[PDB]
Design a protein around this ligand. Structure first.
Ligand SMILES: *CCCCCCOCCOCCNC(=O)CCCCC[N+]1=C(/C=C/C=C2/N(C)c3ccccc3C2(C)C)C(C)(C)c2ccccc21
Ligand SMILES: [Cl-]
Ligand SMILES: [Mg+2]
Length: 293
């Protein structure tokens, strides 16, 4: 079956005065592989991919601030806040060069960090990643009405904060196969207290859709432009129908991105890791063996 356990010893590091939790497994030397989750997940989303990689490479998987087992400061939980904390996490572990494996808002962090630190990125594997969505028509039809509602202060907070819709509704709708209760309970655990749900609401309000917020559109356009001019090895996983990255978009990127291999993981929405962890993990391990690391 698909594993439901999380058999990783907890590690913590102090970051801007807060403790951040992270997985750290695999060999001690070499180039580490840094796995960045997004909304509304945690390092749990990588639990069945890490074991394919850990035999050959160090795997580091932090929980974003306010998420997973990381601390919950008083924060806006803006993308800008996550940039400060992730920048500081990477320096607090003393990382030098890395390979990135990134998803959803973790991909916006990873691509933005790579743009600003290009000499330190030896490869990027990515899936269901943040790109500009120029109009609402380019958001999947089945999810337009809900994300339009999320992007309000009254109805959106009632849904996501009061009723925990991103965890109880949106997350399962991002997986083709049924999630089981152990898996849901791991995703629920950081958010049992409603007042701890601000990241889950601020994130969809940061998504670059139909030109807003314009600062996030600008930041994401910048790292997409960087990506298209970078020789860094790239590995793109995509599913059908997808959510952020539909098949036609994956095919465009497979053509336009330098040094990019694309892999079709079969049926998939947003949390591709939950529908096909073994192909994602085995293809990352293979690709790592071809990098000059
Ligand atoms: C970085 C991107 C991450 C993507 C994650 C995966 O995304 C998958 C695509 O999105 C799926 C979107 N659909 C859903 O989330 C389905 C669940 C919707 C909420 C259903 N629901 C409730 C509904 C309350 C009422 C609503 N109102 C008034 C309204 C108005 C406009 C649009 C939509 C809506 C909804 C949200 C339907 C309650 C009863 C609160 C509830 C309780 C528990 C679970 C689900 C729901
Ligand atoms: Cl989101
Ligand atoms: Mg504090």
């Amino acid at each position: 079956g698909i594993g439901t356990g999380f058999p990783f010893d907890p590690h913590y590091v102090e970051v801007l005065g807060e403790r951040m939790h992270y997985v750290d497994v695999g060999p001690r030397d070499g180039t580490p592989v840094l796995f960045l989750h997004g909304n509304p997940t945690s390092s749990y989303v990588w639990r069945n991919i890490i074991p394919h990689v850990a035999p050959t490479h160090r795997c580091i998987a932090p929980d974003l601030i306010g998420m997973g087992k990381s601390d919950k400061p008083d924060l806006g939980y803006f993308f800008d806040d996550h940039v400060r904390f992730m920048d500081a996490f990477i320096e607090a572990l003393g990382l030098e060069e890395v390979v990135l494996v990134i998803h959803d808002w973790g991909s916006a962090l990873g691509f933005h960090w790579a743009k600003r630190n290009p000499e330190r990125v030896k490869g990027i594997a990515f899936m269901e990643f943040i790109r500009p969505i120029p109009t609402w028509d380019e958001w999947p039809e089945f999810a337009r009405e809900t994300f339009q509602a999320f992007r309000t202060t009254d109805v959106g907070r009632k849904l996501i904060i009061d009723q925990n819709v991103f965890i109880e509704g949106t997350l399962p709708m991002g997986v083709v196969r049924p999630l089981t209760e152990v898996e849901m309970d791991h995703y629920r655990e950081p958010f049992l207290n409603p007042v701890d749900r601000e990241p889950l609401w601020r994130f969809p309000n940061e998504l670059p859709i139909a030109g807003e917020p314009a600062n996030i559109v600008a930041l994401v356009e910048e790292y997409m432009d960087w990506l298209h001019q970078s020789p860094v090895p790239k590995l793109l996983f995509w599913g059908t129908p997808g959510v952020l990255i539909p098949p036609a978009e994956a095919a465009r990127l497979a053509k336009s991105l330098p040094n990019c291999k694309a892999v079709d993981i079969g049926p998939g929405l947003n949390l591709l890791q939950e529908d096909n962890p073994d192909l994602i993990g085995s293809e990352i391990a293979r690709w790592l063996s071809t990098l000059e690391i």
